[PDB]
Design goal:
Chain A: One of its GO terms (biological process) is homeostasis of number of cells within a tissue. Chain A: GO terms for molecular function: G protein activity; GDP binding; GMP binding; GTP binding; GTPase activity; identical protein binding; LRR domain binding; protein-containing complex binding. The complex is a heterodimer of chains A (about 170) and B (about 90). Chain A is of the alpha/beta class and about 170 residues long. Chain A has one domain: Rossmann fold, CATH 3.40.50.300. In chain A, about 35% of the residues lie in helices and about 25% in strands. In chain A, β5, α5 and β6 form a beta-alpha-beta unit. The longest helix of chain A has 16 residues. Chain B has about 90 residues and is an all-beta fold. Chain B has one domain. A four-stranded antiparallel sheet of chain B has the order 4-3-6-7, with no helix packed on it. In chain B, β3 and β4 form a beta hairpin. The chains are: A alpha/beta (about 170), B mainly beta (about 90). Chains A and B meet through α2 and α4 of A and β3 of B. Bound molecules: guanosine-5'-diphosphate, magnesium ion (MG) and sodium ion.
Chain lengths: ~170, ~90
């Protein structure tokens, strides 16, 4: 059963933890308690393939270690998350794409642009802007809300499909 | 070290500065650079630099003015920012 190492990055408070909890959270006992802080495992079925998702969250600074810094760049695919009511968070997305590519020394890194908090009335970033940016990167753009669960699954599953397309 | 160190003006014109610092060990997605009159009468100006650089150009300053320049590192894999390092420079 294929594993997929997924990393969730973006500015403070855009909802990176919220989207991950909403994707994992159910009404069972949490099937895994990973001992690596801010990691999350969950099995799913995407397009038929029964897959295990190891999801690394952006950790708090109390979790810093040189090894964690190394481990995070081995992620196979990255969610670039911004909040649609937070302009700076969208304006800094390009830094995330640029530097992830740099630290992985790779020209094709599976990536999905994620615009979150789409339930909020205080929009400051236009859907068209995010679509245009995602186009220029040749990556998908998914609009999400961790509050209403809209697009949460589509975001992570699209990232898995992109990892697949990468490995052919 | 988790904080950028050794912030300095490397080169200057009467109205612009080329600043340099040393990167921290923690991986940086971008540096946040702010600059303003040391007094503080006016709001600070701010821009971002890619995490792979440790220099930047500040242009459009006023000559003979005391400026406070401040650098923050935004960690790539961790929430929040480094502590700031700052310097004063008089154009
Ligand atoms: N209305 C709304 N609030 C959200 C959404 N996602 C996160 N939040 C709230 O935004 C705040 C910060 O979210 P958090 O997941 O900690 O952001 P993180 O720092 O990126 O991990 C919390 O109060 C969340 O409850 C969303 O999609 N809609
Ligand atoms: Mg978080
Ligand atoms: Na430097």
């Amino acid at each position: 059963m294929t594993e997929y190492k997924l990393v969730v990055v973006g500015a403070d408070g855009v909802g990176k933890s919220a989207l991950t909890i909403q994707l994992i959270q159910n009404h069972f006992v949490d099937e895994y308690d990973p001992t690596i802080e801010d990691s999350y495992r969950k099995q799913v079925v995407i397009d038929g393939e029964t897959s295990l998702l190891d999801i690394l969250d952006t950790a708090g600074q109390e979790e810093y270690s040189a090894m964690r810094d190394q481990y995070m760049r081995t992620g196979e695919g990255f969610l670039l998350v911004f909040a649609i009511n937070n302009t700076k968070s969208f304006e800094d997305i390009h830094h995330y794409r640029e530097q992830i590519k740099r630290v992985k020394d790779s020209e094709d890194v599976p990536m999905v642009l994620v615009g979150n908090k789409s339930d909020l009335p205080s929009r400051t970033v236009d859907t068209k802007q995010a679509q245009d940016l995602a186009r220029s990167y040749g990556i998908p753009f998914i609009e999400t809300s961790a509050k209403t669960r809209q697009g949460v699954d589509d975001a992570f599953y699209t990232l898995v499909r992109e990892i697949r397309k990468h490995k052919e | 070290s988790s904080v950028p160190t050794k912030l300095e003006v490397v080169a200057a014109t009467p109205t612009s500065l080329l600043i340099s610092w040393d990167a921290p060990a923690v991986t940086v997605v971008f540096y946040d650079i702010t600059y303003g009159e040391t007094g503080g009468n006016s709001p600070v100006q701010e821009f971002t630099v890619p995490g792979s650089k440790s220099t930047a150009t500040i242009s459009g300053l006023s000559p003979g003015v005391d400026y406070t320049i401040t650098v923050y590192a935004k960690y790539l894999w961790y929430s929040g920012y480094s502590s700031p390092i700052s310097i004063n420079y008089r154009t």
